[PDB]
């Protein structure tokens, strides 16, 4: 069944996803605002 | 060690035969 460590695994998985998705979310936003002029 | 040494020398000679026949200096009419 769904043991304590498998629960921890999912916690770690979602926390990583939040960190990466939040990071990339912020990086895309900034790059959209502050573009380079060609 | 001695069996291996005899077989190794013999095997080198057999390889030499191969090269001496198939990768010889070709004789050409000069």
């Amino acid at each position: 069944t769904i043991t304590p460590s498998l629960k921890g695994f999912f916690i770690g998985l979602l926390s990583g996803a939040v960190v990466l998705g939040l990071t990339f979310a912020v990086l895309i936003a900034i790059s959209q605002i502050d573009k380079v002029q060609r | 060690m001695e069996t291996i040494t005899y077989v190794f020398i013999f095997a080198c000679i057999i390889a030499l035969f191969f090269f001496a026949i198939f990768f010889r200096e070709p004789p050409r009419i000069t």
């Binding site: - | 060690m1 001695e2 040494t5 020398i9």
Partner: protein, 32 residues
């Protein structure tokens, strides 16, 4: 078999040294 243990090195060098000599002379002939 209770053979002489310097037999191995004596046979190896008997093959290697003169063989290498010939290989040296042959390769430098081809490149000239």
């Amino acid at each position: 078999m209770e053979v002489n243990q310097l037999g191995l090195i004596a046979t190896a060098l008997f093959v290697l040294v003169p063989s290498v000599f010939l290989i040296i002379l042959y390769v430098q002939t081809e490149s000239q």
